[PDB]
């Protein structure tokens, strides 16, 4: 069922799959093994279905959070890097890919949202969310707007929802207590209420998604956006003098983005486990392999030490790390999927008015518990 003698790789369409395919063509020239990199839609969701019948790719790229539910279903193979290999990657990134004491993926890069702003429109970015309404009113009198970011994915609204005390699963005594969910406490209501109020006051539009926000910022129509380092590539080609900075505070407290480690898992049903190890270990996790991916769409801060040491002199990488340092590393427990689909419905319903903030978050909390 999965075909023997070639590597099929899945990676999400916002990452540098072209640069990854350049690593796969160096691999193919060298080994004779054909490598096809693909980016299907909803791939985080297609993988557990197809791979359960034992199908799907040999290697799946995603943030570590969805990988514990994959491992729990026994859909990921235990990777086998020797100690020499592990020492080239930061020890905390291995932690994100451990499940029941076993490494279940190769960590690639550490991702956090940042505030991206157009210095032409706004040379001094706002340090607080509370000053954003006024900022929009001034900018609209010039035919611009203050802020446009992707509201259809809770990943993007979570930093605000958690700033005042929202949380996913409380971390106590070295586990994630799965009956203690903080999506419906006073912090979560305050943060999501602020976002809803911005929409109600015409400062943002509730339908805005990733394409809409990305185009508005890159055509210089909005002053600010919130996005990861993969988005820097299209800003660079497109004329906007931009900066990358700390997320604005809410009620004095730092915005707390969920930090994701982009990771490579090996399908349990794959017959090419030994080849996937060769590609990931000796081709991708190279200075050259990561540069090939990085030149297509930036990775952020990377798990590989040798390459990170020249990536950290980049101001934007420092801002990414500070925003990451102020947030929380995502848990990889299997309940993460239910959490994300619950918060997603909660944010879309609250944003549009389909539900009040209080019962949208109350419904989100019953579904996680």
């Amino acid at each position, epitope marked *: 069922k999965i075909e023997e*003698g070639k590597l099929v790789i899945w990676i999400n369409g916002d990452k540098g799959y072209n640069g990854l*395919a350049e690593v796969g*063509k160096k691999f*193919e*020239k*060298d*080994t*004779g*093994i054909k490598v096809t990199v693909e980016h299907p839609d909803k791939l985080e969701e297609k993988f557990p279905q197809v791979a359960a019948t034992g199908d799907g790719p040999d290697i799946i790229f995603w943030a570590h959070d969805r990988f514990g539910g994959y491992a729990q279903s026994g859909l990921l193979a235990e990777i086998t890097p020797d100690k020499a290999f592990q020492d080239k990657l930061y020890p905390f990134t291995w932690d994100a890919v451990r499940y029941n004491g076993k490494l279940i993926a190769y960590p690639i890069a550490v991702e956090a949202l940042s505030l991206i702003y157009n210095k032409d429109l706004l040379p001094n970015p706002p340090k607080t969310w509370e000053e954003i309404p006024a900022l929009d009113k001034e900018l609209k009198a010039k035919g611009k707007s203050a802020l446009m970011f992707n509201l259809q994915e809770p990943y993007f609204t979570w930093p605000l929802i958690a700033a005042d005390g929202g949380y996913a699963f409380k971390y106590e005594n070295g586990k994630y207590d799965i009956k203690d969910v903080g999506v419906d406490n006073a912090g979560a209501k305050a943060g999501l209420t602020f976002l809803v109020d911005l929409i109600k006051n015409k400062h943002m539009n509730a339908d805005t998604d990733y394409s809409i926000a990305e185009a508005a910022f890159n055509k210089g129509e909005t002053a600010m956006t919130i996005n990861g380092p993969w988005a820097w590539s299209n800003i660079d080609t497109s004329k906007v003098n931009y900066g990358v900075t700390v997320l604005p505070t809410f009620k004095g407290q730092p915005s707390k983005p969920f930090v994701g480690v982009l990771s490579a898992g090996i399908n349990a049903a794959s017959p090419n486990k*030994e*080849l996937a190890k*060769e590609f990931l270990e*000796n081709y991708l996790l190279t200075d050259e392999g990561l540069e090939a991916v990085n030149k297509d769409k930036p990775l952020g801060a990377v798990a590989l030490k040798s390459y990170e040491e020249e990536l950290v002199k980049d101001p934007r990488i420092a801002a990414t790390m500070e925003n990451a340092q102020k947030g929380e590393i995502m848990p990889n427990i299997p309940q993460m999927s239910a959490f994300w689909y619950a918060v997603r419905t909660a944010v879309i319903n609250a944003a549009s008015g389909r539900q009040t903030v209080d019962e949208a978050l109350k419904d989100a909390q019953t579904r996680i518990t």
Partner: single-chain antibody
Amino acid sequence: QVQLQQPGSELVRPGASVKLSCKASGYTFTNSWMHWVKQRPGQGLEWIGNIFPGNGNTNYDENFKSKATLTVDTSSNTAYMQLSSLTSEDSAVYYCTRGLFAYWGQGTLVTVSADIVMTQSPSSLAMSVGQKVTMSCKSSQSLLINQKNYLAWYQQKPGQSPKLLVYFASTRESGVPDRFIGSGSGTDFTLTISSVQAEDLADYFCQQHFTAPYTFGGGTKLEIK
């Protein structure tokens, strides 16, 4: 760091057999396909067959089924080619090459004494240093899958093995001067030397990597004044 040690030469006679050895170092021997290529004076290069050392799978060209047998010793990182029933016409330099004909051993000369067509042009050419050199290679079938043209270019200086210059039509190999530029797609491909130098005297082959027999072109014998 990658090396493919082959013995310099074997002296053999008709009806006998010889076992040719290829010693691989500097890479993971189990995960790379290994090809064997024959180069007879007066004939271009033809693929004999290949071995995947990790599971021992083999594929043979028709002219070497029942003439060649390929084997591996996992533990010594050595590939073997057995030639049976030798005849005068089997006198050639025999190469082992790794991957998509990416690195070549230096070749063993054996002396027996006592579907896809690749049209390369011009077959020989004489240019002066500094001039622009254009070599074309036309394939009887598209070599595109989509992106990705299964076509490479090689430089063979006299008495040396072929050395990969450009792979996948346009990607210059590591170490190659930037004067070498491959271009093209589908069936028409070009190798351009933007400004030749004297060191560039060599024989230039294109080779398709789409499917067996991974056929080579007739070559461009390039000389520099």
